[PDB]
C-alpha cells in the first residue's frame, strides 16, 4: 500500500496549504447571511439597482418562503410590496413569470394571503391574468387559486373595484372561444367555484348570475366536445 | 558550513456540524485516553 | 505576550423573546 | 449592533474590525467562512498574522501581543480576534 | 441561491439548473421511500429523459396499482392508444 | 414519519462528485447511464 | 470517547493532548477553566507559546506553527489547540 | 506520477531523483522532512553539497554548477534539486 | 513589515536585505521575479554565489556559507536567501 | 444550555390542546376570558 500511503501524505500536505485570499465575489452573486441577517438582506436585495440581482433574489426568496418560520420572518420584513412591484414590471416577461411563481409560494400560509390582500396584490394578479405571456398566466391562476383557500381572500375578491369575477369569467369564455387552451380555463373556473363557496356568497352569486349571465355560458361549455376537466 | 532546515507556516479551518446547510464527510479516527502525567 | 480570557455566559447573547 | 465585551485595541482598528465582521456576516453563511474572511482581511492590511474564532458558545484562553485583541458580539455571534 | 465557498477554484464550475434537478430528485426519493434506491434512481432518470426527449411511466404505475419482472414490464412500456398496447 | 432514506446522503454525495467531475450537457441521461451502470 | 477530527502532530503529542483534556474535564465545570488548564500544561510541557479554544459551537481560521495543531471532541465538546 | 518539468541532468540520475522522491513521500509527510531526505540521499550516494526544495507554491531563481538541476511535479508537490 | 524569522547574518546585511526586498515588492509581485531581484542584488554586493527562494509555502534544506543565511516573512511572502 | 433557535422544544400534545382550548372560548364567546380560562384549565387538571 505504498502508493496509497504516498497519496495520503500528499493529500495531507495539500490540506494545510495557506490559501492566498478570499477573492471578492462579483456583484451578481447572492448568498444567505448567517442566521437572521438573510431576511433583511433579501428585502434590500429585492430592490437593488441591477435587474439580474433582483431576479436571482426572487429565486432566493422562492427558496426562502418554504418553511413557515422563514415565511413569517420574510413577510414581516416587508417582502410582499417588493414582489408585487416586480410583478407589475412589464419590460421583461421572465421576471413576471418568476414573480408570479414567488407569489404562489408566498400565498400558501394565512399571513401571506392576508398581506397579499392588504398590499393590493389581488388586483395585481387580476391585472397579470391578461399578460400577453403564457407561463405567467398559469402561475397567476395558481397563485389566485391558492390564495382563495381562505374565506377572507374570497370576500376581498368579491368586492375589489367593480368587476373582478366578471372579467375572470369573461376571459375564460374568451380563451375557450378562440383556441383550445384548457388549462387556463379550467383553473379560472375552479377559482370561480372556490369564490362561490365563500360563507356569505349572496354578493358572489348575485354578481355572477345577474351580470355575467353565467348559466347559458356554462350550458354551452358542457357539450361533450370540450376536454373533460373543462366539463367538470 | 552547517545545515539548517526551513519551512513556512500553514493554517487550518475547523467548522462544526451545522444544523443547516452542512453535511461533513467523516475521515477521522478514535483513541482511548489512558493515564496522564 | 499578555494573556486574555473570554467566555460566552448564559443568556447574555441569547435573547429568548 | 456591536456590544464589545472585551477589547484591547485602538478606536479606528476596532471600528474596522466591526465593519469587517458586518461584511462577513452579510456575505457568508457557514461559520468557518466568516472566520477565514475576518482573519485573511486583517492579515491583508493590519499585520501579517491573525487568529479568529466565530461562534455562539465558547471562551478561549489565548496569548495575544498587546495592542491587538477583541471579543465582541455582532447580531447573535461572538467574534474573537487576536494577533500572535 | 448561489452556493460559493470562500476557497474554490474556477476550474470547478457548477452548471446552472443542477440544484433544481437534484431538488426534484430528492423530493421524489423522499416521497416514495423506496427500498432499492439505485434502480429507483435509474428508472426515474430514464423516465424524465424520455419525457423531455419525446407519459409512459405515470400510466404504467397507475395500471400496476389498478391490477393489484416489473422492471421488464416498465422498460417495455417506456419504449412504446391501442397500437402502442398492441406493440407492447 | 417523513424522513430522508438512511442511505440517500451518501448516494447523492457520490452522484454530485461524478456529475461535477464529468461536466455533462444532459443531467437526466447522465443519471440514467450512471445508475444503470452501477446497478450491474 | 475522544475522536480526532483534525490533527497535525506526532502520535505522542496528540495522546498527551487528549489526556490533558480528559484530565481537565474532571476538575473544571466552566469552559474558560478548561482552556486555562490546557494552556498552562502545554505552556510548561512545550515551547511556551500556545493557544486553546473550547466550546460547543465555533468555527475558526488560525495560522498555526507547523507540526502543532489539533481539533478534537471529548464527550460533546470540541477543543481546538494550536501554537502560533 | 513524476512529471519532469525542467531539468539538466543525466538520465540515470534523473531516475534516481524520482525514486528518492517517491520513498521520500512514502516515509514522512512534513515538507522539510521530504527535502532533507532527498538532499541526504544525494549526499550519501552521489557527490556532496546539494540543495533541495520540495514545495507547493514558490518562485526561486538559483545558480548551479552545470549538469546538476532538476524540477519535477511529483504528484502535485514540486521538487527542485540542484548543486552549489 | 518584515519579521526576521531566522537569520545567521550580519546586522547590516539583515537591514540591507529587508530594504532591498521592500524595493523588490514595490518593483514586482511574482515570486520568481522577487527572488531574481534579491539574489542578483546580493550577487553584485557580495560573493556572487547566492540562492533566493521566494513564496508562501515551501520548506528547504540547504547548504550555506557560514554567516550568510536569512529567512523572513516580509508581509505574506517568505524569502529564504543564502550563499553556498 | 440553550443557544440556538431550533433548541426550543414544541411538545407533541401542545397544539391539539390549544385548539380545544380556543374551541371552548369560541363556543361561549365570553367577556371574562381569564376567569373562564382559569376555571376550564383547573377543571382539566383536576379531572386528568
List keywords for this structure.
part of a larger assembly; 10 chains; C: mainly beta; rod-shaped; F: 40 residues; mainly alpha; 0% strand; globular; IQ motif and ubiquitin-like domain-containing protein (chain B)
Quick structural overview:
Chain A has 232 residues and is mainly alpha-helical. Chain A contains 15 helices and no strands. In chain A, helix 6 (93-106) runs parallel beside helix 9 (135-147) and helix 11 (165-177) packs antiparallel against helix 12.
Polypeptide structure, described:
This is part of a larger assembly, with one copy of chain A (232 residues), one copy of chain B (37 residues), one copy of chain C (17 residues), four copies of chain D (84 residues), two copies of chain E and one copy of chain F (40 residues). Chain A has helices at 2-15, 38-45, 51-64, 68-76, 80-88, 93-106, 110-118, 121-128, 135-147, 151-158, 165-177, 182-196, 202-212, 214-220, 228-231. Chain A is built from 15 helices and no strands. In chain A, helix 5 runs antiparallel to helix 6, helix 11 (165-177) runs antiparallel to helix 12 and helix 11 (165-177) crosses helix 13. The longest helix of chain A is centred in the last third of the chain and has 15 residues, at 182-196. Chain A is elongated, with a radius of gyration of 24 Å. Chain B has strands at 3-5, 10-14, 29-31. The radius of gyration of chain B is 19 Å and the shape is flat. By secondary structure, chain C is mainly beta. The chains are: A mainly alpha (232), B mainly beta (37), C mainly beta (17), D alpha+beta (84), E mainly alpha (88), F mainly alpha (40). The interface between D and E is small, with 4 and 3 residues. Strand 1 of chain B pairs antiparallel with strand 3 (60-63) of chain I, so a sheet runs across the interface. Chain F: It comes from Chlamydomonas reinhardtii. Chain F: This is EF-hand domain-containing protein. Chains D, G, H, I: This is Dynein 8 kDa light chain, flagellar outer arm. Chains D, G, H, I: Belongs to the dynein light chain family.
Helices and strands of chain B, in order, run as: EEE
Order of helices and strands of chain F: HH
Helix/sheet category of chain F: mainly alpha
So what's the overall shape of chain F? globular
DSSP strand tally of chain B: 3
Amino acid at each position: 500500500d505504498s502508493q496509497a500511503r504516498i497519496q495520503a501524505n500528499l493529500r495531507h500536505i495539500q490540506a494545510f496549504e495557506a490559501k492566498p485570499n478570499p477573492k471578492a465575489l462579483p456583484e451578481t452573486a447572492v448568498t444567505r447571511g448567517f442566521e437572521k441577517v438573510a431576511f433583511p438582506k433579501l428585502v434590500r436585495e429585492l430592490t437593488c439597482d441591477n435587474a439580474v440581482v433582483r431576479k436571482k433574489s426572487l429565486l432566493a426568496a422562492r427558496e426562502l418562503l418554504s418553511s413557515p418560520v422563514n415565511h413569517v420572518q420574510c413577510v414581516a420584513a416587508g417582502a410582499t410590496p417588493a414582489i408585487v412591484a416586480l410583478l407589475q414590471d412589464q419590460t421583461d416577461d421572465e421576471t413576471r413569470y418568476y414573480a408570479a411563481g414567488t407569489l404562489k409560494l408566498l400565498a400558501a400560509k394565512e399571513v401571506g394571503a392576508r398581506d397579499l390582500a392588504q398590499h393590493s396584490g389581488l388586483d395585481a394578479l387580476a391585472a397579470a391574468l391578461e399578460d400577453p405571456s403564457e407561463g405567467v398566466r398559469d402561475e397567476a391562476y395558481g397563485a389566485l387559486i391558492e390564495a382563495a383557500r381562505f374565506d377572507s381572500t374570497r370576500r376581498a375578491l368579491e368586492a375589489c373595484g367593480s368587476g373582478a369575477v366578471l372579467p375572470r369569467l369573461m376571459e375564460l369564455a374568451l380563451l375557450e372561444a378562440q383556441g383550445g387552451a384548457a388549462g387556463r380555463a379550467q383553473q379560472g373556473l375552479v377559482l370561480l367555484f372556490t369564490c362561490t363557496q365563500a360563507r356569505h356568497n349572496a354578493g358572489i352569486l348575485s354578481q355572477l348570475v345577474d351580470v355575467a349571465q353565467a348559466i347559458p355560458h356554462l350550458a354551452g361549455l358542457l357539450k361533450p366536445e370540450l376536454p373533460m376537466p373543462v366539463r367538470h | 558550513i552547517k545545515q539548517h532546515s526551513q519551512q513556512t507556516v500553514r493554517e487550518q479551518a475547523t467548522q462544526m456540524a451545522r444544523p443547516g446547510v452542512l453535511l461533513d464527510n467523516d475521515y477521522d479516527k478514535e483513541v482511548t485516553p489512558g493515564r496522564y502525567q | 505576550g499578555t494573556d486574555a480570557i473570554t467566555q460566552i455566559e448564559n443568556g447574555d447573547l441569547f435573547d429568548f423573546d | 449592533k456591536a456590544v464589545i465585551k472585551n477589547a484591547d485595541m485602538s478606536e479606528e482598528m476596532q471600528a474596522d474590525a466591526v465593519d469587517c465582521a458586518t461584511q462577513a456576516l452579510e456575505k457568508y453563511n457557514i461559520e468557518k467562512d466568516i472566520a477565514a474572511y475576518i482573519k485573511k482581511e486583517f492579515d491583508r492590511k493590519h499585520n501579517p498574522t491573525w487568529h479568529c474564532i466565530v461562534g455562539r458558545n465558547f471562551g478561549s484562553y489565548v496569548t495575544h501581543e498587546t495592542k491587538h485583541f477583541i471579543y465582541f458580539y455582532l447580531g447573535q455571534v461572538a467574534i474573537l480576534l487576536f494577533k500572535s | 441561491m448561489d452556493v460559493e465557498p470562500i476557497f474554490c477554484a474556477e476550474q470547478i464550475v457548477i452548471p446552472h439548473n443542477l440544484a433544481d434537478i437534484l431538488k426534484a430528485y430528492t423530493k421524489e426519493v423522499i416521497r416514495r421511500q423506496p427500498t432499492d434506491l439505485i434502480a429507483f434512481s435509474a428508472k426515474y432518470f430514464t423516465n424524465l429523459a424520455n419525457v423531455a426527449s419525446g407519459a409512459p411511466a405515470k400510466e404504467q404505475l397507475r395500471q400496476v396499482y389498478t391490477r393489484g419482472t416489473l422492471t421488464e414490464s416498465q422498460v417495455t412500456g417506456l419504449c412504446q392508444a391501442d397500437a402502442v398496447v398492441a406493440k407492447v | 414519519p417523513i424522513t430522508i432514506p438512511g442511505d440517500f446522503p451518501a448516494i447523492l454525495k457520490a452522484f454530485t462528485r461524478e456529475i461535477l467531475r464529468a461536466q455533462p450537457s444532459n443531467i437526466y441521461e447522465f443519471g440514467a447511464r450512471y445508475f444503470s451502470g452501477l446497478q450491474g
